[PDB]
Amino acid sequence: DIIVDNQGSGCMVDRPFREAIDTFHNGLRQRIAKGEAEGYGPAREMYGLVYDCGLEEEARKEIKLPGYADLHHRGVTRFSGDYEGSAISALKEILETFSADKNSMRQVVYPKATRFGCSGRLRRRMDWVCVYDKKPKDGESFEGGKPCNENKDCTYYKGSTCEWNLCYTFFAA
Ligand SMILES: [Mn+2]
């Protein structure tokens, strides 16, 4: 499992933060695909989230002007936290707390989301938002299919490569 990156330098957030949030996201999703994340239910077809610098740039607009991402029909998650130590360990913790927010986790874990980007700002407090390309609906079921081993096991989107039992597409347009 490693970060899969799409496009350029709307990626302003430093590697270790970016990789911490990405590994948290795709780490969970991978366990849920394998049906082995406690509390999340039966194995299923899961797309990995491609880290998208464009979507990180939208996340940054979203912090600057709340409501922005919804205008573009995006999923959004938010996580914050006061802290005092290293900004990097604070974030590690904030995510753990964030993982106990059942509403937020619905977006994090949505099998038909295929890309995301997050941005954060320091005020000592940190605020992060993530933008996702597909937002689940309330009551929408997440179960279905099976965890990919070969590319053919990916049904949701057309041009998908299976890797680490996660399906990846770069064209879910
Ligand atoms: Mn392969």
Domains and CATH numbers, the chain: 1-173 (3.40.33.10)
- Start-to-end CA span in the chain (Å): 24
Q: How far is the CA of 168 from the centre of ligand 1 (A)?
A: 11
- Give kind and range of the element (H or E) at residue 120: strand 115-122
What is the β-pairing status of strands 75-82 and 125-132? antiparallel
* Count of other CB atoms within 10 angstroms of residue 14: 12
Q: How far is the CA of 20 from the centre of ligand 1 (A)?
A: 24
Q: How far apart are CA 19 and CA 161, in angstroms?
A: 21
What is the β-pairing status of strands 161-163 and 125-132? unpaired
Enter the resolution in angstroms: 2.6
Tell me whether residue 50 is exposed, middle or buried, using C-beta atoms within 10 angstroms of its C-beta: 0 to 12, 13 to 18, 19 or more: buried
- Give kind and range of the element (H or E) at residue 162: strand 161-163
The amino acid occupying position 62 is E
Q: How far is the CA of 11 from the centre of ligand 1 (A)?
A: 27
Angle at CA of residue 37, ends 34 and 40, nearest 5°: 100
Q: How far is the CA of 14 from the centre of ligand 1 (A)?
A: 29
